[model samples]
Target chain A: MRKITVLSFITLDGVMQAPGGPEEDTSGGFKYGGWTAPYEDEVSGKIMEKQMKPADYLLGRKTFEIFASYWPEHADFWPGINDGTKYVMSKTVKKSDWKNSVFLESLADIKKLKNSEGSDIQVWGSGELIQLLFKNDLVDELWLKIFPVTLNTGKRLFGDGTIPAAFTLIESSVTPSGVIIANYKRAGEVKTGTV
Target chain B: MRKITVLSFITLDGVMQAPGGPEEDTSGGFKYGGWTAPYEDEVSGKIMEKQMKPADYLLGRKTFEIFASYWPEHADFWPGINDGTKYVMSKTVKKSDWKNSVFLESLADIKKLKNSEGSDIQVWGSGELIQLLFKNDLVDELWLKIFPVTLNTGKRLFGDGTIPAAFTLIESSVTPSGVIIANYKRAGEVKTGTV
Candidate 1:
């Protein structure tokens, strides 16, 4: 089965809202819009670079629209993703307005797409979908780049009703900017005991 | 001004409650009481060893009581803490029941204690005091040990009213068990920008 890997840029507080720019996500009046910008180290660059090659993109409606408007304008930016097969999950959008994009009608549609034999499917900035994936046992791997900052308030990686599960840390590294890149594979169960 | 260093064992989801044992804490009905127990690695041992050398301790009433009850019984376990100057912030406790412990009457008492000249003043497992310190701008250092696990519900290191601030990571280490030992000093303010 093809893997469903999630790549997220989150704060130490687990806030992942608008790490790109101030205008990226202003919902809830999030003041710290570009929180991760100042700490964009090479490790993050390399991780993003590594993700683009041979991965099908799965994005939520909001993130899809954002990327559709942004990536196309920048002719030389993230070519692999812009040219790769992308499944955009949206109820409103009847047709994908971007190149190599496919609009998902329902969760069942993505389940079919997810089951198809292909490269690993990658998801980004889909807070709602990530929550669904957590509850549904659909996520196979997580590449969480935890930037060292605290917004105190913003959208988080994990929200209310996120099913608790164990993840084995397959690899981890830190950059000069204090960004922690942790790669985890789904583990069987969350064990509890005393030290 | 002596630096107030906060050391905590936290889950990947940032939960920092009842890491030692099953019955350590159940307030809020957190089922995963002994979450961090089975993941204790060499990194934690080294951290404990370093804390014994030259550091005073500051604890909230609950943590002060827990450590007091647990450590004193296990003589020769931690000599530095048992013999060192320890401050306990409590409104109810008339006097500290532990040796080498002082009860704090108010936040003002901690302010004075914080101003006193000494080595690094360590805070461990004192969630209430840590929250107060966050709001009061008293914490000078943070040593957070993040283990690879997700307890969906538990007491967290970062609570409500935690004032925003920046921290410079001075040192970090990871054990085979995926325990992250990170030492960070209070830098100044949380900086934001766009990438």
Candidate 2:
């Protein structure tokens, strides 16, 4: 069985809008963009490598579109294990021209994929798809590379509608530069305690 | 009059226990301490300098004790401006041996300080005091630095009984390292929004 994991970079004030650049995502008139670029260092790279090395890749339509336009063409310079199977969740895209890629549409299709035999499936920067996966309780693990910055306002990976879910920390490490990579396995439903 | 501002570093899961280091704070059995060290960079330093430069410092008893035990002895290495005023919110500390240090015991004392002429009175790492200030609606501004990491459990900056408050952003910035610094002035009483 394949386990689904979601990864992201977020800011301090719960803003997950645009950590890459101003052009990446500017929804809700968020003036602060590209907040995560300056914090990247050698330590962050190593943590990214460790997290990315052990899984197949899953991409949402928008995220797939973004990566497809970039990764394949830059393959020579970005030589690492790029051979992993890439599954793109999109109803619109009937065909995936990218190599080692497949298109999966609908929640039923995702259910079928989850039950199929495979290793963990990694989801990176798929903000919209993550909401659905998170709501349906399909995600089995969460690998978060939380940066130090807070955008104060922007698109967040987990917003208000997120289903209550409990997770157990399997492994965690902090980079020398300050990025924290935490691996969590879904334990059960989220429980709230009264103070 | 000096405006009181609260600054906090929190996690996505509402964990605000300790972002600096294990020794920085560990009131609860928070295993994952020192989570914010990795995302440091020149850009983050610059943003921090800009934020810290404009205000005098306020701290809770624990955080104040933590600083008094460290900063005074190490003042020579710190910037001259940061070494200026250190106001600790404590009833027990009868006298401040450190230079430019004062103790505030009651809410009236804080109110008096705010009414007096000075620049913004900034609170750093004083989680409990911030909560109290939020409860009383005494905080004039909030400079929140929201980090991306989320511990499964820890102390939280906001909680139940905290009156709803509104804020208007005066300034904001995202460091290249992914840290966001947002300056907000209290607009009116906080209102709860449906999620």
Candidate 3:
């Protein structure tokens, strides 16, 4: 079965909004944009690269807009970005000029894509889409690089829409700057007992 | 200078409510109580004990009530529970039968307790109180045992009231069942740049 992986750089408080740049995401009036900058070093760069697999890019409308505008211009720096199929989950954005760009209209389309034979699907920085995936129980893995900061208020990676589920840590690491790279795969339903 | 450490068994998504048992907390109609049970094993038990220091327990009214009821009944199993002071932060509850229990009326009282000459204060499973600590920037350390599950809905450790701040991971470990034991100390403010 082709896996659906959700990847993002989140704060310790689980805030995943606007970690790349100040203008990356300002939808909810998020002021802590570019929160990932200070902690970035060679260790984080290598760790990030190691996990950046060449897979079909699945993204939300806002994240798709951000990547489509930037990756095309800086294709040389990250060639794999433009090389993969860009499966954008957007209702309004019917089309895109970015290479291999494909718009998925709804969650049904995403469910269909997950079952289709292709490279492993990777969803990046789409808090809304991630929440939808959680609500529908579609996510297969979570590749989260947890930074050592708390934005306190912003769009979080996990919302109330998520269903109760368990995951197993397949791999984990930390950088000198305290960025925790955790890779978790879906582990059946939540098991209960007494402590 | 006494430190105020916030400790809890939180899901990867930051939910900290009702982890011990189903009836531990039913407030807000939370259904996923005892979510931490399945992930607990001998490794987790030992790890939890290592971090459970004998310090003044600063708790919210709800958590205080729960602990006060249970710990006193099972005092022989965990002697440290009865040894340290219990500072319950609440406006309504004026008194308690829990030994060494004290009532703190407001945030100001908690602040005074932090600066007072005493043992380090440890706050456990107090979601509302933890958020208040974050809002007031009073948490000195986060000793969290992050289970490999997502509750999706419940009282979260970090709320919207938290201020932007940074922390440094002083120690970290993972259990066989994917529970992450992360110890973080307050670093400073959130630093930003370009990624």
Q: Which DockQ value does candidate 2 get?
A: 0.05
Q: Highest DockQ among the candidates is held by which one?
A: 3
Candidate 1 on A61-165: residue-level lDDT in tens?
Answer: 899888888887764757767777888888888686687888887778878988888878889998887887777888899888877676688888877646667
Sorted on TM-score, best first, the list reads: 1, 3, 2
Query: Where does candidate 2 stray beyond 4 Å?
Result: A77-82, A191-195, B1-11, B15-195
User: Which 10-residue window of candidate 1 chain A scores lowest in summed lDDT?
Assistant: A73-82
Judging by lDDT against the true structure, name the best candidate.
Answer: 3
Query: Going through the candidates in order, what is the number of backbone clashes in each?
Result: 1, 24, 0
Model 3: per-residue Cα lDDT at residue A168:
87
DockQ of 3: 0.79
For candidate 2 chain B, the 10 contiguous residues with the lowest summed lDDT are: B186-195
- Tens-place lDDT digits, model 2, residues A69-107: 777786664433256778888889967677778899888
The alpha-carbon lDDT assigned to residue A84 of candidate 2 equals 70
For residues B47-137, what per-residue lDDT tens digits would candidate 3 score against the true structure? 7676765778899898888888788987776766788999899989988877898999888898899888989888888888887888888
